[PDB]
Design a protein around this ligand. Structure first.
Ligand SMILES: *Cc1c(COP(=O)(O)O)cnc(C)c1O
Ligand SMILES: *Cc1c(COP(=O)(O)O)cnc(C)c1O
Lengths: 413, 412
């Protein structure tokens, strides 16, 4: 890393936007892969909704409706879901609680729609649990087979592995865009091309890519894409599912009840149009509003500027972890091959000990399986530490982790 | 109504706790049956969580402790306490809303208990979220969807209860309070017949939890669901309570992270209840603010809240009855309304009534109120609905009555 690159991450022009970070200047929060800290403008936007337009034809409900629709449009534009006139395709944005529910919705609705016995559902060994178990469940129910894309020695899914596992039997392919443990960026567009050539649907878990890299559903050629707002400076409780307009109309509803209907009788019901077809009951309008505020915040900061800073932070994190001979990185030792997350272990020390000591030094990391236990079994690991970076981190935060790990070794080495 | 009762609802010792009402003194919000307004302390608790403990490090331990305190508060609020009065926090499951909890129950309890030929019994009063999940699970299991009907006084009689809940019944799911009629159903009595038939009792408490005392042990229900946003909590938080043995027997609903104990490539071992039913990152801040709403409601005393809202409902029905051009959809006795009063201005579409009322800063709901099978039973296509909460007052209701006269002047 050059003198200038290190200088760029020594400066921190973003940390002050976050009240919890400004109020706790000694704390080095390196667990953004789990959830983000909240920008002040996102917190006040949620409180502002509840104070000024809280409603579920009167004026408050009309404003709340307009605030929701503007948030759908902002989210659609953020992931490139725009029509030929750049008009955002807001009606292809479906709100959930998190990525987990969106993937449950997809596996249930798309699985019932498309899966026949003998079909193949292809996922990767890097998948988060929420992109595994809904497929275990629906495969057993439809008679379909669950197929796994494996990695090579460099934690990558090769084109040969893509063509070897995605065969004619494939009906659904659901792959994470970025691994929440390895930080590998998977070639989603290339996987989609093979997936479509075999007549299958492409689902993308973008929970770890939406906060860090450019997401464009049209350039990615995916049929469905899901992510969580709380991982990109939005509030908790809001997940997003984008869907190809024709596919969402064919897909059957997931949750049923109020607000997803057009009419109901004692014995049947007629479904509402998309996206209302997939949103049952009272939605979190304030959380949706605050998510739109998060998009406007990220837009104003420039995602290209965010990505550039987060590549440098990731490289500095991997580079500085590599100077500790008692640290084994779980993944690539090349920082540029890490988006966000860097998994590692202090040799012979359980991650629970590493994390407990690091918190005594005001360092927040994640320890355990990281909801990717099949991946860890593949790599012969019971548990790992995981440090993750966001644009509001800086060089000092990483140095504080490195100094904290020397204190871990001094105690457990 | 006595002279003191009118003076009681004339004074309003609560609405100043709600920033949107204090900032808009001219607005008469009578749509609390759709959603509550937020007390200041509930809004600040949500902001406070994100500013102070948003997350084995300190912030995560604090957020874990804050979430568990909220479960305990919610369980004690609905009387879910053990034999030592300790709240049964592990029987509280968080959803987005009542709708998702009812979808969870219908899917998980239906798969666990429904056999072909079994009866699922609901009532004609049900909200759509307590209808369609039963339509769906019945079509899949070969069960029958049976309806408890009303008498001429909008009540479910003991005779109808015994007639419809028969030996073939496996699941009974009835609303505690109608979101259109305001009728309070005898949930304890329905559960008695339900359990004698060897069936499970499910309660939609979305319209009762904010108004009347809910005690899961006195109601004898097996599962109960409600929404926090209808009881001064934030949106996005729903609550499902269940008997501990029943929640263990019930299969998971959503699957994925956080609800497991271990995972392999081909299978998974589930976490214990309630984590078994909570997949992925939960809305910890909304959970925290929901506990703050419980603390706020506890400080006001439900017995005081119910007593005030009973007076407001009586005044609303009494005043609506003074208009010859208003037809109440439901009982004409105000004490038979919990919260909600549905009505129609003769010959005027509810959309017209609501448009004019908004010009007069009156907020009501117009349409089907997500209870279309009920309106079809009552030969209505659409109605207005005004609803009362403790932070309403006599002025709000009078403003509605005056606005209704402006409606008749324009469309009568
Ligand atoms: C509002 C309502 C529901 C649904 O509540 P949501 O929060 O919208 O899911 C269920 N039952 C009754 C009686 C209701 O009034
Ligand atoms: C965090 C994560 C999920 C689950 O996200 P939730 O918001 O907790 O539902 C899914 N996939 C990946 C890659 C993740 O990192």
């Amino acid at each position: 890393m050059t003198d200038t690159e290190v200088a760029q991450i020594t400066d921190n022009p973003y940390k002050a936007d976050f009240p919890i970070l400004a109020a706790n200047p000694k704390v080095a929060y390196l667990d953004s892969a789990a959830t983000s800290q909240r920008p002040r403008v996102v917190i006040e936007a949620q409180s502002r909704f509840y104070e000024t337009m809280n409603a579920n034809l009167y004026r408050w409900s009309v404003d709340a409706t307009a605030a929701i629709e503007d948030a759908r449009a902002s989210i659609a534009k953020f992931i490139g879901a725009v029509d030929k006139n750049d008009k955002p395709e807001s009606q292809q944005i479906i709100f959930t609680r998190n990525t987990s529910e969106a993937l449950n919705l997809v596996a249930s609705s798309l699985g019932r729609y498309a899966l026949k016995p003998g079909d193949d559902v292809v996922i990767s060994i890097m998948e988060h649990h929420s992109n595994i178990i809904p497929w275990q469940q629906i495969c057993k129910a439809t008679g379909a087979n669950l197929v796994y894309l494996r990695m090579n020695s460099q934690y990558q899914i090769t084109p040969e592995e893509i063509a070897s596992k995605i065969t004619e039997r494939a009906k659904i392919v659901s792959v994470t865009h970025v691994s929440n443990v390895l930080g590998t960026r998977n070639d989603i567009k290339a996987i989609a091309k093979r997936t479509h050539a075999m007549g299958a649907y492409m689902v993308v878990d973008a929970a770890q890519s939406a906060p860090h890299i450019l997401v464009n559903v049209h350039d990615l050629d995916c049929d469905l894409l899901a992510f969580s707002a709380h991982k990109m400076c939005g509030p908790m409780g809001i997940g997003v599912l984008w869907g190809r307009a024709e596919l969402l109309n064919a897909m059957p509803p997931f949750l049923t009840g109020g607000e997803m209907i057009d009419s109901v009788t004692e014995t049947g019901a007629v479904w509402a149009p998309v996206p209302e077809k997939f949103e049952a009951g009272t939605q979190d309008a304030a959380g949706i509003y605050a998510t739109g505020a998060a998009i406007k915040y990220l837009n104003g900061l420039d995602m290209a500027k965010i990505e550039k800073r987060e590549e440098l932070l990731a490289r500095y994190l991997v580079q500085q972890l590599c100077t500790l001979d008692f640290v084994d990185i779980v993944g690539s030792k090349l920082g540029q091959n890490h988006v966000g997350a860097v998994a590692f272990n202090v040799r012979g020390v359980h991650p629970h000990d590493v994390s407990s000591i690091l918190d005594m030094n005001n360092v927040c990391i994640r320890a355990g399986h990281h909801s990717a236990e099949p991946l860890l079994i593949e790599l012969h690991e019971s548990s790992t530490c995981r440090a993750s970076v966001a644009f509001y981190n800086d060089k000092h935060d990483i140095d504080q982790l490195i100094e904290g790990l020397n204190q871990v070794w001094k105690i457990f080495g």
